[PDB]
Structure 1
Amino acid sequence: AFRVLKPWWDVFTDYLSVAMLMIGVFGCTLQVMQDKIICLPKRVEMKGLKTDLDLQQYSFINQMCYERALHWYAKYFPYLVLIHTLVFMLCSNFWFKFPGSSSKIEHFISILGKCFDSPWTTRALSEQAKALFEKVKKFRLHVEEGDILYAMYVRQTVLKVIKFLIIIAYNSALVSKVQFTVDCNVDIQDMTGYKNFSCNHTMAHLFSKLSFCYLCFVSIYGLTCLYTLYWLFYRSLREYSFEYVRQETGIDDIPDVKNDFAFMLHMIDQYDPLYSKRFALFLSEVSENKLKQLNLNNEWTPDKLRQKLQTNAHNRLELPLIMLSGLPDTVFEITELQSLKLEIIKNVMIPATIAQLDNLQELSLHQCSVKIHSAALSFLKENLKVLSVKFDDMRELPPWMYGLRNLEELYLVG
């Protein structure tokens, strides 16, 4: 929620901001505690030089020449540091404090958590994730329209860059402005009897040195921005194509994702490429088919199919099926079945496991789309005797049945 979203440069910037806050709070604490100007009337063996002023006028002169002579920037510098630190914190966290994009970010982080937490990811790379594939697809269709999150992040970085430029620019000139000593000509004569004053305050030189190190910190922050600038203006991150998962697991699917998804994939890769590899699968169509087959094999089991069995019209041990989305493996574990009945069962792949069903001589087909693999098709070519087929719009009619040389009886309707 707050961890996998932070590239190394982002964490470095965050800790730089923490240092910014610490510098600022220390400076303001010192200003509140010990920031005191000390003033004397300026233009006066060696003896004493008593000035015959009681303490109160001394305090008054301190205040007057502190306001007048001492530079406003010297006074406000710690408070400036606080305000700039706070604005930096706001412009950094606004990416996640805006609810409209925050909801999408939350759903994204949750789905990747469930994805790299899913063992079926490893199983497919080598149960309930089937119900998560629809969440994956709904989100992917949802956010391909976006990319506004990327634009908002880019604008945040641009604002950081611009504020950096302005801060460095004016601070470079204003560092020299502060001074240890100072002379003021305040028209307080005839109210305290003096007009020329020499003053100096404790903070001055310290702040100078403080300012220097502060500036250096800000500078390296800017360099971070510069890095992202290259990272923004050379990689052309508007599009993401794996071309690696496709080559390592041999999956030609998952071609591309839109600009928003490209960018979030890139950010995940910057954080952890392994999590991108783990999340890559929940989009694959072929892996989705494999998961459908897996759940289908799990929930249709051999005892259930044995109970379902019976004898058909042509006196054969048949396992009629009326509603299916694939071929259960346990169906191929019962070799004694002699016939099969299928109604409205599309996306059917017959594996060579039908060759396991050695005693196979009749088949009943009613409005189903079936594709056989070459080994299983050869087994059926050398083993089939009887067949029933039904097709409505010529689509459920299979072409491969024109290859079985050993078929005797074929029954057709429609």
Structure 2
Amino acid sequence: AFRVLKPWWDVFTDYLSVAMLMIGVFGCTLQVMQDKIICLPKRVEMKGLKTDLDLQQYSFINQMCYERALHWYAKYFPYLVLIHTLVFMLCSNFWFKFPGSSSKIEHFISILGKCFDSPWTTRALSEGEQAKALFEKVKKFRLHVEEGDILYAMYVRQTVLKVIKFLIIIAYNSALVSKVQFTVDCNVDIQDMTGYKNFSCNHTMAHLFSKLSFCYLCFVSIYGLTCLYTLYWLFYRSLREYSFEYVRQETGIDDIPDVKNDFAFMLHMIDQYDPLYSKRFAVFLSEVSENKLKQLNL
């Protein structure tokens, strides 16, 4: 059930994504119950002032000044956040699920699991046909993995995609954010139809939108910091080579090869979840075990 491929980066990013989704949906849903653009005509003891306007010349004015005096950011922010969070969700579900790759994990994980629970590992540390079948299947899988190209470009283009998305999001959410004020001026030229040429209008939900924008900025910043740390881990230290320095010291087997390229990256990434499957895999790589099994067979 895809339970083995989930580092702390993935769970943290998914939590940030669901937080973004909930904040965006809260903003959107509570955007049709109370949002108006109530406008009155400016007049460029105390008594009331009569505007002499009908009950439709106010609806006219409201909806005319809702699209001539309000910045496009103040009316579509929830839509932007929902769209971008959905894009992030689709982005961070694409590597381990795309055509030609779903089938592998359905049974490779089961093979690894039955490799983990085999009790013969303890005896090996100090049945012939089953071991032979397992070893030949492992060899076939190894040959299959090393022969596949077009695998680094796609994945390396995933995290950077999130990084560039971060850059653009923070860019245009920091640039145009001071245009969500609470009292705007509308100056349409509807003179004959109503009578007044200058009006004052005030968006109902401006301050709450500003607070939501700040919260979304904070969440995006944390998400981008996580992505930057991911890149730093990927780039700072090359992840295409392994160092078997402990094995020759604690076991004496000093002939274990160090894999490179894509397979080395996969092994290293698996190293951050549970540093025990590697030894189980290595047990089915030494030749001494096969020699002992062959001798026992005779």
Give your verdict on TM over 0.5: yes
Structure 1 position 151, deviation (Å): 3.4
Aligned-residue Cα RMSD (Å) equals 2.1
Change in 2 beyond 3 A, CA 1:190/1:265: same
Deviation digits for residues 102-145 of structure 1 (CA, Å, limit 9, x no counterpart): 33444543332222122223332357344211111111111112
Change in 2 beyond 3 A, CA 1:25/1:293: farther
Calculate percent identity across the aligned residue pairs.
100
Q: Distance in 1 between matches of 2:59 and 2:249?
A: 80
Deviation digits for residues 199-218 of structure 1 (CA, Å, limit 9, x no counterpart): 11221111111100110110
Preserved CA contact (<8 Å) 2:41 2:198: yes
* Structure with the larger RCO, 1 or 2 (CA within 8 Å, 6+ apart): 2
Change in 2 beyond 3 A, CA 1:75/1:128: same
Q: Distance in 2 between matches of 1:242 and 1:123?
A: 22
Preserved CA contact (<8 Å) 1:189 1:195: yes
Structure 1 position 235, deviation (Å): 1.4
Preserved CA contact (<8 Å) 2:2 2:105: no
Alignment length (residue pairs)? 296
| TM-score, normalising length: structure 2 | 0.91
Change in 2 beyond 3 A, CA 1:61/1:74: same
Q: Distance in 2 between matches of 1:113 and 1:168?
A: 43
Structure 1 position 183, deviation (Å): 0.5
Deviation digits for residues 135-176 of structure 1 (CA, Å, limit 9, x no counterpart): 111111111123643432211001110111010011111111
Q: Distance in 2 between matches of 1:32 and 1:284?
A: 67
Structure 1 position 246, deviation (Å): 4.1
Change in 2 beyond 3 A, CA 1:120/1:43: farther
Preserved CA contact (<8 Å) 1:28 1:78: yes
Structure 1 position 44, deviation (Å): 5.4
Unaligned runs of 5+ in 2: none
Preserved CA contact (<8 Å) 1:245 1:277: no
Change in 2 beyond 3 A, CA 1:199/1:122: farther
Q: Distance in 2 between matches of 1:244 and 1:238?
A: 18
Change in 2 beyond 3 A, CA 1:241/1:74: same
Preserved CA contact (<8 Å) 1:246 1:252: yes
Q: Distance in 2 between matches of 1:129 and 1:33?
A: 67
Change in 2 beyond 3 A, CA 1:141/1:53: same
Structure 1 position 26, deviation (Å): 0.9
Q: Distance in 2 between matches of 1:261 and 1:227?
A: 22
Give the secondary-structure state (helix, strand or coil) at the position aligned to 2:56: helix
Change in 2 beyond 3 A, CA 1:124/1:32: farther
Return 177-186 or 29-38, whichever deviates more. Answer: 29-38
Between Structure 1 and Structure 2, the one with more strand by share is 1
Deviation digits for residues 18-77 of structure 1 (CA, Å, limit 9, x no counterpart): 111111111111223322221111235311112232333222221111111111111111
Change in 2 beyond 3 A, CA 1:6/1:151: farther
Preserved CA contact (<8 Å) 1:101 1:149: no
| TM-score, normalising length: structure 1 | 0.67
Q: Distance in 1 between matches of 2:142 and 2:256?
A: 12
